Amino acid sequence: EGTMVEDQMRAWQSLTQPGKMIHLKIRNKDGDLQTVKIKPDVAAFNVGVNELALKLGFGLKASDSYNAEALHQLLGNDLRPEARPGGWVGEWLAQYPDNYEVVNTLARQIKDIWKNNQHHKDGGEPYKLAQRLAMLAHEIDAVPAWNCKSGKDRTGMMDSEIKREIISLHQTHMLSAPGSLPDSGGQKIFQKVLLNSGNLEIQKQNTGGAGNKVMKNLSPEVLNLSYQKRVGDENIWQSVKGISSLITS
Amino acid sequence: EGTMVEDQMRAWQSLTQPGKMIHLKIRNKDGDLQTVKIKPDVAAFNVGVNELALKLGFGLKASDSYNAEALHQLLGNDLRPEARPGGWVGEWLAQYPDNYEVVNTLARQIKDIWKNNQHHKDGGEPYKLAQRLAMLAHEIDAVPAWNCKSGKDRTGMMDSEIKREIISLHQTHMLSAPGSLPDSGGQKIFQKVLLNSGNLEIQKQNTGGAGNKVMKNLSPEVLNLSYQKRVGDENIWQSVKGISSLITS
């Protein structure tokens, strides 16, 4: 998975070479290939949400070299939690949108996590940094994109995490604090999302059986990612992990 | 030559005082003096290409104080070779010109030379930094200007170096690596340039005899600037240095 990462980062760099304008082919409404011109701007991150990265800790140093550049691109050159946002966030806020409250909160939380290196552990919830990066990107009118090795297991879990937080926030609430377990109502939301999202059908379509490889229950108990607590239900947890253990392939 | 440098730097500073608009007198097409208004912006460098500066090393520390400010003005506040260009280069690239390839290469090479202090020695070619600064300035639509004590010996040599590289590049090539001797074809180009440029006539006009004082052949062999290798011809080397040794004045 190391060489996989440099291959991805190299690809993004080659498309965002400064002053280089990108040409894309698109089928128009008449079924004819047509060339369009794009000025891309990509902020590329890598976090790692496995036990291999959170319990015993692999590639933390390797990934943080990429993440530092991306944060400077996204928030500016000053990452103190009390400073004012810069970068893309600053440009969005300079328009004085009616969205300022949520944007300011998300930027502050991200700086907090980065400062204490809270993303190196799972203080009860391992997607703390990835989830907020995606939500912030949607707020400031960028496009969020995320990926895994195969695009169905860890990708599916992050999909569910984002949907849960968006739904919880939509009820005029605030955002939850980093590294905190969901409350009773949040747990009910999360349970409904995990089953009523489209992830199970994606799993079946892509493999032939429904399941998720993120749910493991390793033998030394200190190597588990603590989804038993986030999903406060044994049966639902066993339902998310479906035939996933029978797909050794 | 020290006080000469502070006099020049002081002059540039006095013309580029912030918020100060400059008034120039120009003879229009009717032969009448007319006043025009200029908003100047000058990046002033000093390098030193003598044996006094490259072999035994004089004023390296003094000049680098000026060069640091000028680079920040030209490339921005981040001079890491892998970062993205800022400053004037960044502003030019933000227009997405069809010139991006050459500009990116030149900026990268300049940062490399600055990082390793390669301009403090002559790894086979002493104009490595000056030549690239002038070429980069022309690419991003600035005006390049260079000077010597008298404006005919070291100025003439830098003139020839730039012309050789431009001609070599015009054949759709790439740029050569810093501190590398020219190949066979490059040597043929350089030999033709040194004689068919206008430098010899400038020498004769300004002095009465053709020659160049840069060609010395000092007695302790470790004090020579190694143009015997760059100009792979004894007769041509002896032809560039003409009556230059008979003009003690």
Curated annotation (Swiss-Prot), chains A, B:
<feature type="short sequence motif" description="CX5R motif">
    <location>
        <begin position="148"/>
        <end position="154"/>
    </location>
</feature>
<comment type="similarity">
    <text>Belongs to the phosphatase IpgD/SopB family.</text>
</comment>
<protein>
    <recommendedName>
        <fullName>Inositol phosphate phosphatase SopB</fullName>
    </recommendedName>
</protein>
<comment type="function">
    <text>Converts phosphatidylinositol 3,4,5-trisphosphate (PtdIns 3,4,5-P3) to PtdIns 3-P and prevents the transition of PtdIns 3-P to PtdIns 3,5-P2. It is one of the known effectors injected by Salmonella into the host cell and is required for invasion and for an efficient generation and maintenance of Salmonella-containing vacuole (SVC). Alteration of the phosphoinositide composition of the plasma membrane causes membrane ruffling and actin cytoskeleton rearrangements.</text>
</comment>
<feature type="active site">
    <location>
        <position position="148"/>
    </location>
</feature>
